Design a protein around this nucleic acid. Structure first.
Ligand SMILES: [Mg+2]
Ligand SMILES: [Mg+2]
Ligand SMILES: [Mg+2]
Ligand SMILES: [Mg+2]
Ligand SMILES: [Mg+2]
Ligand code: NA
Ligand code: NA
Ligand code: NA
Ligand code: NA
Lengths: 52, 142, 45, 176, 166, 110, 77
RNA sequence: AGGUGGUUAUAACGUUGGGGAUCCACCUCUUCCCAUCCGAACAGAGAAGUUAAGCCCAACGGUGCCGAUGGUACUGCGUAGUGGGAGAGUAGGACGCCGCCG
RNA sequence: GAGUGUAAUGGCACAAGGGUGCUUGACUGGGAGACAAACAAGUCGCACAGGUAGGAAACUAGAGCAUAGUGAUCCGGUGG
RNA sequence: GUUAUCAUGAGGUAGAGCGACUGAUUGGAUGUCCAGAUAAACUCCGAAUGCAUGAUA
């Protein structure tokens, strides 16, 4: 909350499972139709065997 | 020999025994014991000799309690040493006792054996003593 | 390593101590100048 | 279970009065409990000789002359350090209103099996019990016909009557 | 605000149904997610304390601080001045967004999770690899709940989506 | 540790030097979530000399002015000036400052 | 044969100087103490070495309070 | 059901129940006064919600606290007398008592 | 049951223990009255005038939680 | 000035105690508990005397 110290780039982005926008720092080089910031990931919790 | 595992101080001022014992004048563990009629310092060597004597009697059936522990350091100067120049060479520990304090407690043996076993122990001690039986004792069940 | 100090600037002087290996810069404190009857800066000599 | 005691009135108090009392082979004594103040009176060494010097316990039926008649139990005996003679007694008044803690003898009444060899050992000689004064046994019998090997009967693992075993539960009342 | 709606709109209306509270203030609510890691190796090589700060900030999104020692133990070369820990205390929505970054992507990237709490209802997690997250020498994770026993804590815990076990 | 043990700790620190006599009575304030109160107290006597509050009377800081002024009129009639202001475990800020400022701006040397 | 002892320092003559009931002039020393064995009450001040002294003339009063804490104060008129 | 004092806990701590007219509180959000790694604390802005918790009331001898009478220890004077009289423990007491303001 | 640079003892919760913001009162002229006391020495403390620091203010500040860390006179040095 | 009486005050000795601290310590059941017990440099307690102040004789 303090001005300054907090690092920037913390902007919303939707992760891909291989879609849910979540405020995260990691800004992968991509875009998508706003909610442009996108990151591609491997099997999420929807595809992990034991987790499902 | 009975002595503290460690002490805070190496020397101690020789105190003063004043009156009758107000603690440890009653039997708690056994049914028979011996109690002092004088005030005196009791040494560890005296206690070990008396305990071996009472344990030698009663064969191997019964339990003996020592109800005093020597925690008072004493010293002695020695021959050819004049007065002054500080305290002398250490000489072990003693336990100060006053009249009424119980020394040896015995249980597990009939009345006559206990009376005789503590008589042998009292004859190794520097103070005259007295036999005590607990007031709830039963002469018709031993 | 704690020596006498004399802060200056009749003249106005204040005597005090300080550790010469801990405080290595000359002392400079505001004190009351009796001659001027107001606070002025006194520096070590 | 019952003892007959009587005692004379006591008026003076202090170092001088008490020393003169025992000069006649008497004992100062007090009685207190529940409603009302205490009672100061005098008993004799002959009178209380069989009340205290005994393996038994009794409910003292006390008749203090000049004051009245009550029921009491032994609470505290004061002994001389050297002579081991009685110098003071206080009796707790007992009524049928609330329980009272007292310790009754416990007797190991045959031994279990062949037994481990002359053991049959009574360890805890007395057990604290709280109950109405007219519910306290004269004795605490136990039957011992099980576990002739290394065993122990605890204080908690026993139920006698409408008593209450306050005698430091999870302890050991017999063994071997 | 990803699991925030899922909790207030959906998860809360079920906790009261089962445990049967007479109100809505008796239901457990995790209040913070504390993260920490021990840097005893930094007692002899302290250049790896700043790097931990930089890594411990890209994950949660909010700056962390060093933790100074508190004891004088020679067996760890420890005197009561050294920085040997880095902690971050996420709270309110900051832990809400962080929680979704973990239940979906952290446990999935594991090479599930133990079921044992402190007894007051605070599940703590020590993961031995820091690359389990996207932005990245493990780090502790503690969810301090408003529950009372493990029963109430577990119901709040499993509703979020924590993989847990059995 | 529970929003009150600290306040009582701060209360006793302030009371270590601030009290009230027949002259210079103590000005005491209590801040609730919705209201605000004031009281003039004579510690030697133990009784309250005057009072004001906003229970029966803008944002919360805008209402502390009226409490800070209504306590002046009550003390103005009774003949009180040069009161001493105690924090009562409250930081000197916000609503509490406006109450103190209004009391000073009136007839009291708070 | 020797002693490693034989040392001592001068005693400081500490303690209560004006007892409860007596009259004090302003400035009078009431208690010399190490620490606040006694605490300053009304009209009583404390020095650098915890010396208790009278700020006003009057009657010396001792008073025990919570946790058996002792206070010294002067009763004026 | 609040604020603020006096009385050295017989006043404290705790346990089990009750309480939402209005109050106290938790509660909601950080644009502003102000604050920490974090509106957790502190501060500001509100009344959408609850008595669940703090808080207050009833009952409880549970932990602590108070505590006789008698006897004893010790002791001033004096050479057994003449005066003072503990500590511990036991009967018991105690779930406060009083002022001001709203 | 910790800490309080340093022995021991006494003290400390409104902390005298731990943090930060600003500061130099580790002030000029002072000593009503006491403690202690062979002397020489030692200790605590004013009232108010001048000018400051912190504070919203009340107020506090003539060094440090206290008690050791020391050396007369003669004779010389330095600044007014 | 002294002594007595009354009023007021501050004590930490004798004694006592040890789940009130520190150190030491006995036996049991088994760090937990039940008993037993110690000290110039231990104290949750605590006299008798003595001491200070005022008044009267
Ligand atoms: Mg000395
Ligand atoms: Mg008496
Ligand atoms: Mg003078
Ligand atoms: Mg003694
Ligand atoms: Mg003793
Ligand atoms: Na000497
Ligand atoms: Na006598
Ligand atoms: Na007593
Ligand atoms: Na002990």
């Amino acid at each position: 909350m303090k001005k300054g110290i907090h690092p920037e780039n913390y902007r919303p982005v939707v992760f891909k499972d291989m879609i849910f926008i979540t405020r995260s720092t990691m800004e992968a080089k991509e875009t998508i139709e706003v909610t442009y910031p996108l990151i591609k990931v491997e099997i999420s919790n929807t595809s992990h065997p034991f987790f499902t | 020999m009975l002595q503290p595992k460690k002490t805070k101080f190496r020397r101690q001022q020789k105190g003063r025994m004043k009156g009758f014992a107000q603690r440890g004048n009653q039997l708690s563990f056994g049914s028979f014991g011996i109690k002092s009629l004088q005030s005196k310092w009791i040494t560890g060597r005296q206690i070990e000799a008396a305990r071996i004597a009472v344990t030698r009697y009663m064969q191997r059936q019964g339990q003996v309690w020592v109800r005093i522990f020597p925690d008072k350091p004493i010293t002695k100067k020695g021959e050819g040493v004049r007065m002054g120049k500080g305290k002398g060479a250490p000489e072990g520990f003693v336990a100060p006792i006053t009249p009424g304090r119980i020394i040896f407690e015995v249980e597990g043996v009939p009345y006559e054996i206990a009376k005789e076993a503590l008589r042998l122990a009292a004859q190794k001690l520097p103070v005259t003593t007295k036999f005590v039986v607990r007031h709830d004792y039963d002469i018709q069940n031993q | 390593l704690e020596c006498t100090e004399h802060k200056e600037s009749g003249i106005s002087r204040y005597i005090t101590t300080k550790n010469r290996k801990n405080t290595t810069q000359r002392l400079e404190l505001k004190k009351y100048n009796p001659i001027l009857r107001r606070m002025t800066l006194h520096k070590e000599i | 279970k019952t003892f007959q005691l009587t005692g004379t009135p006591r008026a003076e108090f202090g170092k001088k009065a008490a020393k003169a009392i025992r000069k006649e082979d008497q004992i100062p004594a007090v009685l207190y409990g529940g409603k009302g103040e205490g009672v100061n009176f005098i008993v004799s060494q002959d009178a209380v000789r069989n009340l205290i010097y005994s393996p038994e316990i009794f409910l003292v039926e006390l008749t203090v002359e000049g004051s009245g008649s009550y029921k009491a139990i032994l609470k505290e005996i004061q002994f001389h350090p050297v002579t081991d003679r009685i110098i003071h007694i206080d009796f707790l008044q007992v009524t049928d209103e609330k329980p009272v803690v007292m310790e009754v003898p416990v007797v190991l009444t045959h031994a279990e099996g062949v037994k481990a060899g002359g053991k049959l050992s009574l360890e805890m000689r007395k057990l604290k019990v709280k109950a109405l004064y007219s519910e306290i046994p004269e004795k605490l019998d136990i039957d011992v016909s099980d576990l002739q090997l290394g065993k122990t009967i605890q204080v908690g693992e026993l139920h006698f009557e409408g008593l209450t075993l306050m005698n430091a539960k999870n302890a050991v009342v017999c063994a071997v | 605000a990803n699991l925030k709606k899922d909790y207030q709109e959906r998860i809360v209306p079920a906790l009261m149904k089962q445990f049967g509270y007479t109100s809505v203030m008796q239901v457990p609510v995790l209040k913070k997610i504390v993260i920490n890691q021990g840097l005893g190796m930094a007692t002899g090589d302290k250049k790896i304390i700043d790097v931990a700060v930089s890594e411990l900030t890209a994950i949660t999104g909010q700056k962390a601080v060093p933790t100074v020692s508190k004891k004088d133990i020679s067996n760890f070369k420890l005197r009561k001045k050294m920085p040997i820990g880095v902690m971050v205390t996420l709270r309110r929505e900051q832990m809400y967004e962080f929680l979704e970054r973990l239940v979906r992507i952290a446990l999935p990237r594991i090479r599930g999770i133990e079921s044992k709490l402190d007894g007051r209802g605070n599940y703590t997690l020590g993961i031995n690899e820091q690359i389990i997250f996207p932005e990245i020498l493990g780090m502790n994770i503690t969810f301090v709940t408003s529950a009372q026993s493990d029963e109430e804590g577990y119901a709040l815990l499993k509703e979020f989506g924590l993989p847990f076990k059995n | 540790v529970t929003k009150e043990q600290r306040r009582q700790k701060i209360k006793a620190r302030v009371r270590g030097k601030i009290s009230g006599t027949q002259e210079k009575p103590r000005l005491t304030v209590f801040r609730s979530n919705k209201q605000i109160y004031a009281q003039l107290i004579d510690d030697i006597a133990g009784r309250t000399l005057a009072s004001a509050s906003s229970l029966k009377l803008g944002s919360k800081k805008e209402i502390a002015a009226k409490v800070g002024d209504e306590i002046a009129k009550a003390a103005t009639e009774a003949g009180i000036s040069t009161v001493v202001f105690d924090r009562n475990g409250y930081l000197f800020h916000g609503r509490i400052k406006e109450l103190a400022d209004a009391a000073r701006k009136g007839g009291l040397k708070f | 044969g020797s002693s490693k002892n034989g040392r001592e320092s001068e005693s400081k003559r500490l303690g209560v100087k004006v007892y409860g009931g007596e009259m004090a002039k302003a400035g009078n020393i009431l208690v010399r103490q190490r620490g606040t064995v006694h605490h300053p009450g009304e009209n009583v001040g404390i020095g650098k070495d915890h010396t208790l002294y009278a700020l006003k003339s009057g009657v010396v009063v001792f008073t025990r309070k919570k946790n058996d804490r002792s206070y010294v104060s002067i009763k004026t008129e």
